[PDB]
Amino acid sequence: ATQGVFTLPANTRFGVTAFANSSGTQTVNVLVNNETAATFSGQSTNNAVIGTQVLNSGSSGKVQVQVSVNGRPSDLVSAQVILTNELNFALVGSEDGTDNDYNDAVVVINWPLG
Numbered sequence: 001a002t003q004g005v006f007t008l009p010a011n012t013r014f015g016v017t018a019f020a021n022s023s024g025t026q027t028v029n030v031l032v033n034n035e036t037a038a039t040f041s042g043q044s045t046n047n048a049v050i051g052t053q054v055l056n057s058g059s060s061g062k063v064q065v066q067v068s069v070n071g072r073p074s075d076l077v078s079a080q081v082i083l084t085n086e087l088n089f090a091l092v093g094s095e096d097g098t099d100n101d102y103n104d105a106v107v108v109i110n111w112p113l114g
């Protein structure tokens with residue numbers, strides 16, 4: 001199944017934050033309406049924040065997270081969770097290798113802000 005694609009409410013600010021847990025440099029791309037809106041890159045085996053930013057979901061609300069290592073796409077897992085019908089988390093894990101810890105880049109999208 002497709003992973004890392006989330007439909008947000010239109011024209012809504014959201015946070016996106018990426019953590020790294022791999023010996024390989026992670027590249028995280030965030031697309032809004034199929035167009036790159038932010039790109040994070042970094043290397044850490046200790047959960048370092050490699051990027052954090054506030055974006056707007058735009059007219060379509062379509063947000064997509066892509067993760068790759070030197071252009072090779074990682075295998076993604078994702079889900080969205082809503083607490084008290086108000087607080088939203090869009091969660092992405094990714095695997096760049098064979099150990100299947102799925103933490104090599106971890107991406108958290110959260111909304112609403114403010």
Ligand SMILES: *C(=O)C[C@@H]1O[C@@H](C)[C@@H](O)[C@@H](O)[C@@H]1O
Nearest residue numbers: 021022023024096097099101
């Ligand atoms: C490369 O060595 C594999 C890679 O980096 C490890 C340190 C560990 O984070 C593993 O999960 C990751 O896929």
Ligand SMILES: [Ca+2]
Nearest residue numbers: 100101102104
């Ligand atoms: Ca891994």
Ligand SMILES: [Ca+2]
Nearest residue numbers: 021022103104
């Ligand atoms: Ca890892």
